[PDB]
Paper text:
Although the core glycoside hydrolase family 2 (GH2) fold is conserved among all GUS enzymes of known structure, two loops positioned adjacent to the active site influence substrate binding and catalytic activity. The presence or absence of these loops and their lengths have led to the classification of microbial GUS enzymes into several categories : loop 1 (L1), mini-L1 (mL1), loop 2 (L2), mini-loop 2 (mL2), and no loop (NL).
We determined the x-ray crystal structures of TlGUS L1, TfGUS mL1, and TfGUS L2 to 1.6, 2.2, and 2.3 Å resolution, respectively. We found that all mL1, L2, and NTL GUS enzymes from the oral microbiome contained a predicted N-terminal signaling sequence, indicating that these GUS enzymes have the potential to engage with polysaccharide substrates in the extracellular milieu. Despite T. forsythia having an asaccharolytic physiology, our data demonstrate that it encodes multiple GUS proteins active against small and large glucuronide-containing substrates.
Numbering used by the authors:
A (entry chain A): 28 to 72, 79 to 576, 586 to 707, 712 to 801, 814 to 885
B (entry chain B): 29 to 707, 712 to 885
The structure:
């Protein structure tokens, strides 16, 4: 036999507080037992950035003629490896694999010890220098023990496989395949070898076989190129039809195999056109898909291969055919699944936000680019290599004196990296992701890669949705020879927030759906936009509710929207997967019904809604959605798209009416038109309502807008789940009224000052109830602090048919109010 | 009069603070918190470090309060665990001992007149030998884990210094259908330097519009004085009687006035009932024999520690009411007023106790602290009509097996004499409620006569779980009834544990499957329902709850809940609902399962066997599969059951054809062919499936290899201490503990008659502790056993791993997941063999996946 590879994940010990573990040390008290993948930042997300030590003892008797390697799939950010007390290898860069040769350091006794010093603290010379994703530290990807013979495919070529496959000619009826081999001989004698190259669909069928003789001098290495000309009878690879092959490579000495290594192969040719976009195998197709971050709360980035497959499966069932690996190279499993499932892939190294001037940052960046290209060279799913994302974002934060020099270093580094891609891989495109900032225009940076990618957020971070088409049409107009691609577009959503009046940045489900519908449509309407990737597949941990699915991978409405917009299978399903409750405060004493707007995601011409299995109405689908306006009797109801479906269970909903004249047998989110449904105890906070005589609601005031967006987006201190309640508010309300019957009520007022910072004597006011003084003075900025919530809870007894009148008494500045709850209690 | 507002906002917390007594403006290194708060919400979970922080934590806060002439200001702490020292503007202002009862702190002597105030609280949840709970099966969460209130009164007021009680104590010494007497005992205080002539108004009310009785009493208190005054409302008419079924509630409004102006006011609950416990027939209330059936409830909710909202208390008790419960035991400690108000309003008879668990410390300091805690519980919760039982010890002899022999005699006498003193105090403080004690299956109670001291003998019993078989429960209790015809018997605890990811067609005790819990619960409940001398039973426990020292399937969590930690009902909850509810009940089981996977037992197999059950109190019910009738089943003891054999695919289940108001249950059903192609995951050593929710990965129960198929070859399933598998915490993993914990010992290997191809293969293996132990969480480092369990692994004659020293290179409880790819050729199938060197190989799980290369 030839090459052996097993997992090396088990039996490790970890400590965040060890000073030095280089020398063999049997101590384990105080160390944490871990099984890789591991990150030490899975829970503390500031989060700990620093040194962490791993150590392990293991048994391995070195046999004659064998070589032993460790392959680390990923250590963030730098690693130093020590075997039996001796330095054995180091690596810089948290996103690419590396190999360590154990053989020089093994004990003949078989008793081995290894330690790894990992460090994820900031280094000016190692990107990512800053970004809005977490830099989880540790050995967060698996580790493998590899045994080979002393003649083997190289282990020292930037962590790549040492086997590099190229298809310089591909037609439907034949192709040329060239395979470039890096071979190493570790023995002290010259050696004569044979190299068997087989192109296979599977173990029983081969499409081409080649046999190559090679002789290597003692301690030698050599590069040999093998060509399979005019291969035939293959299927072409495309996202739609991802026909996959592989190259079996057997290195033999004396007819006995001494190494072996299979690599993927797909047959395809492709190009990008400025007017019509992406063509693969002569066919024009729209690339629509998603970015995907390699993290999942509460596990950090220490993900199982099962999790990788689940993610990419979700993308494929969405109808996606396009995958951007966020800002870094990802696990082999991810690329294997893309080959297998059918995604065209954009992969980049993590030069994000900013650049460090100088040759150390240049060198580390160059090495990382070569590692990515070499390590993922053979994946047919990859069509784009990139190397900078939003590289000017941090200009706003830098001293203006540095800006000229940073632009010069950015231009110079981009040209070096562009040149390296084009030399290492002439058969893929280069790209860069830019964003809505004038520095790209002004420096001409977008002229350097083959593809101009734009991260655009019109209607979310700036402007309105239609400004997206305006922006892209103007780019196409200025640059009719560029290839345009939307590398990021998306809006956020909290699956507890719902509004019949969604608005920019409110984080409601409906707002994300409308954003996603508009931009995707505007992309579909434009052939010159080669494609688009939603930011982001799933909610992730950042600095982040931007996913089409939740952190634990459950689809939101927007996911089903994209499935209706993208899938070729027929699609028709109800929206609101995370909502089952509707509550409506009556707008007049004669109200008896709850208004319920329902929607479905479909690619059919029309769809019909059934209530309790009786037809409600047929509705026309436009841009992936159908919609019905229902007025329902309060109670439970079943919704469905067919009557008495034989295979689809109905959706159960619960709709309630609050009477116009309340009795408190009353929860309101002030300052916002969305409901907040608190999942801990099923507590439904209503959208705001102004008080009117005979009813209940807030009196006076203005809704808070900050930077032109509703409410504050700052983190509300001291509470986790209730931030969307506190973040919206009325400024300068006179109070709150409710025409309650006589009785005793528990009353809650939620209040917070918006941008620990203390601002005394700035915002002070009193609260009274029916002339009774409750809190003579609340100093929100002073005694609590900016972003520190204040929850005033108390009981009051309404007497003499007075109703309930809560009054604010300004002392300094203006009162604020974020939410109100009123409950009837017995006493 | 009286003003009360929440005081929960604006606090700062630090676990690393030496001392914050003196007013100090810095906030660097402090966490902003909103009470309720505990610092043990996260470090009690599976965080890689057994144990949690018990020690000092400091809180501080600045606040505005301008003291008004003629006002007093108090803080009321609803609970701080375990001790609290309060400092206002640098001065000691109060301290409390005990983590489960409220306390008041008078702010007034320490307030700055100009209004800018500083407060710091030093809290501590270290172990203290003189302060129970000393040890227990629950977590001692530290901090101010219940709300704090700012209370303003006049200078004459209902006392704030009577063991934290309201200073208003309502008793109904006579309750009759045609009339009742209510006596209200008031403790008053005068902080004025002058004597005061006061009036006191006492009104019994249904609501603000309706008075049942009214009294007006003149009280004069001396300067700086205090007094107790008793008010009697005789022959109150026109009330409705309180019972769990009909919880008619009233309250006593009390106003204290000085020259007609209100200086204090405080309402308190009031319900009218009479009740008794009978040795032969059980509980009677208002003349009607009713069976008390309900649950224990702990005050925690993972992952929030015990820092719960009042919304969460209401949700817990509403769940119990919807289960058909009419009986609540507050686990081992007094709970929040909200719990008790909701018991009054919803209708549960309540048992409440102080946390003397497992053991007693000899000495007057322990005696004193437990005495105070008893007075605090009874006084603070005195007025709640829902309380019918007070208690003060729980399995008080449990820890004896672990104590030094020379301590036992004095521990036994300390226990006996403390139980007598606490019993005496209850009877003196509250003649109108019963005393009880929870005992467990241990002969100590019989030897000492401790069970003769309370009026009610409670048993925590676990037949078919910890000892014996289910039917030994009725034998145990019948013998108790025969031996003690004068006692009152009540099952204060019974339950079994379940993980909602574990399922078996062959349930067995301690596999933690859902089905075993349902079967345990069904058997003991109906045995209780058959015995009128058993006045009642409380399930252990309403919800899965934090108990950090636990191991088993899910470390740190006691999984005996009827509902999960986030309050979702398991099967056993719906079983209890079917056994207890008066409303009609009929509903499908398996709320946490939608997948069934079956390995074909022969090449002709085409159908997946699916056993379905439903919970009902009807005579029979009908199962419908894809809305066609499958079959009508008779209901026996709350359950109907059906044996289906279904074609692989998605199917609908329902109890009515095309229900107009109930969505069907959708299930997903799959058959692994007799001969596999790996397009295959097995829990070795166990008859239960493990459904890993992170990724919906379903590990089949074990199946022995036979020619032409796949499975484990040789070996014996591991049993330790009478329980399947090992119950130790499997290190380095969390979700997969129940997968690793079961295994075959000395297997030859594994086989799969797979087609030619490349396959990814995973073998999961762990060296185990050979002898069970009481507490498996105190290991200081890893236990290595080199040279004891050594073997090699080959596949089809190819050497994969020349030697693995499981005990030596990994260690006891350290998982080893061996993952690799192998290419099957030459029609050979897949043959994985172990090669013993020392000791025997082990194997907990196998997974095989076809890959392309
Ligand atoms: Ca139906
Ligand atoms: Ca927050
Ligand atoms: Ca811990
Ligand atoms: Ca574990
Ligand atoms: Na708000
Ligand atoms: Na197992």
């Amino acid at each position: 036999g030839g090459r052996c590879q097993i997992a090396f994940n088990s039996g490790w010990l970890f400590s965040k507080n060890e000073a030095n573990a280089v020398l063999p040390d049997r101590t384990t008290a105080g160390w944490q037992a871990v099984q890789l993948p591991h990150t030490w930042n899975d829970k503390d997300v500031g989060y700990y950035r620093g040194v962490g030590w791993y150590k392990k003892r293991f048994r391995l008797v070195p046999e004659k003629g064998k070589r032993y390697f460790l392959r680390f799939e990923g250590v963030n950010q730098t690693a130093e490896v020590f075997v039996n007390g001796k330095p054995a290898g180091e690596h810089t860069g948290g996103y690419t694999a590396f190999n360590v040769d154990l053989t020089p350091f093994l004990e003949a006794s078989g008793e081995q010890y290894i330690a790894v010093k990992a460090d994820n603290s900031h280094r000016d010379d190692v990107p990512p220098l800053s970004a809005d994703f977490t830099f989880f530290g540790g050995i967060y990807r698996p580790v493998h023990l590899i045994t080979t013979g002393e003649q083997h495919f190289s282990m020292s070529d930037y962590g790549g496989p040492g086997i590099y496959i190229t298809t310089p000619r591909v037609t439907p009826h034949g192709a040329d395949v060239t395979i470039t081999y890096h071979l190493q001989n570790c023995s002290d004698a010259p050696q004569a070898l044979t190299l068997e190259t087989v192109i296979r669909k599977d173990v029983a069928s081969a499409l081409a076989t080649k046999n190559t003789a090679v002789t290597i001098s003692a301690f030698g290495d050599t590069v040999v190129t093998v060509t399979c000309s005019d291969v035939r009878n293959f299927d072409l690879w495309s996202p739609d039809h991802p026909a996959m092959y592989y190259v079996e490579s057997l290195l033999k000495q004396s007819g006995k195999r001494v190494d072996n290594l299979s690599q993927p192969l797909g047959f395809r040719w492709f190009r990008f056109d400025p007017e019509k976009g992406f063509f693969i195998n002569g066919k024009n197709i729209k690339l629509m898909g998603a970015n995907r971050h390699q993290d999942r709360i509460p596990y950090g980035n220490a993900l199982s291969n099962d999790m990788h497959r689940q993610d990419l499966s979700l993308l494929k069932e969405m109808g996606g055919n396009f995958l951007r690996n966020a800002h870094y190279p990802q696990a082999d499993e991810v690329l294997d699944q893309a080959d297998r499932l059918g995604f065209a892939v954009w992969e980049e190294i993590p030069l994000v936000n900013e650049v460090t001037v100088g040759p150390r940052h240049t060198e580390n960046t160059t090495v990382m680019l070569k590692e990515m290209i070499k390590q993922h060279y053979n994946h047919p799913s990859v069509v784009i290599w990139a190397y900078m994302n939003e590289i000017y974002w941090a200009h706003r934060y830098k001293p203006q004196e540095e800006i000229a020099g940073r632009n010069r270093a950015t231009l110079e580094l981009a040209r070096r990296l562009e040149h390296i891609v084009r030399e290492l891989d002439p058969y893929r495109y280069t790209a860069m992701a830019m964003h809505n900032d004038p520095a790209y225009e002004e420096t001409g940076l977008g002229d350097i890669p083959m593809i101009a990618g734009w991260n655009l957020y019109h209607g979310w971070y700036y402007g309105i949705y239609e400004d997206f088409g305006t922006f892209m049409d103007e780019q196409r107009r200025k640059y009719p020879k560029r290839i345009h691609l939307i590398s990021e577009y998306g809006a956020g959503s909290d699956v507890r927030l719902y509004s019949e009046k969604p608005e920019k940045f409110d984080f409601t489900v409906e707002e994300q759906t409308r954003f996603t519908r508009s931009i995707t449509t505007q992309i579909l309407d434009r052939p010159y936009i080669a494609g688009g990737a939603l930011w982001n597949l799933a909610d992730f941990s950042s600095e982040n509710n931007k996913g089409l699915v939740t952190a634990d991978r459950k689809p939101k409405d927007a996911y089903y929207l994209m499935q209706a917009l993208l899938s070729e299978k027929p699609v028709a399903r109800l929206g609101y997967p995370f909502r089952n409750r509707w509550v409506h405060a009556a707008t007049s004493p004669s109200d008896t019904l709850v208004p319920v707007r329902m929607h479905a995601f479909s690619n059919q011409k029309s769809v019909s809604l059934y209530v309790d299995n009786r037809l409600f109405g047929e509705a026309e689908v436009k841009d992936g959605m159908a919609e019905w306006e229902m007025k329902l009797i309060p109670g439970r109801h079943l919704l469905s798209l067919a009557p008495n479906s034989p295979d689809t269970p109905e959706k159960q909903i619960d709709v309630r009416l609050i009477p116009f004249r309340p009795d408190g047998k009353l929860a309101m989110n002030v300052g916002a038109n969305y409901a907040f449904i608190d999942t801990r105890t099923d507590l439904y906070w209503l959208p705001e309502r102004t008080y009117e005589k005979g009813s209940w609601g807030v009196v006076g005031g203005e809704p808070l807008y900050v930077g032109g967006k509703v409410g504050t987006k700052e983190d509300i201190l001291a509470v986790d789940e209730e931030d969307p309640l506190y973040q919206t508010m009325r400024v300068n309300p006179e109070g709150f009224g409710a025409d309650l019957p006589d009785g005793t009520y528990e009353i809650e007022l939620l209040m917070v000052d918006y941008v620990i910072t203390y601002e005394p004597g700035q915002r002070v006011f009193g609260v009274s109830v029916n002339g009774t003084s409750i809190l003579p003075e609340i100093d929100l900025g002073g005694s609590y602090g900016l972003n520190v919530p204040c929850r005033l809870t108390f009981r009051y007894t309404v007497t003499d048919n007075a109703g309930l009148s809560i009054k604010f008494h300004p002392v300094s500045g203006e009162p604020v109010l974020s939410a109100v709850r009123i409950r009837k209690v017995e006493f």
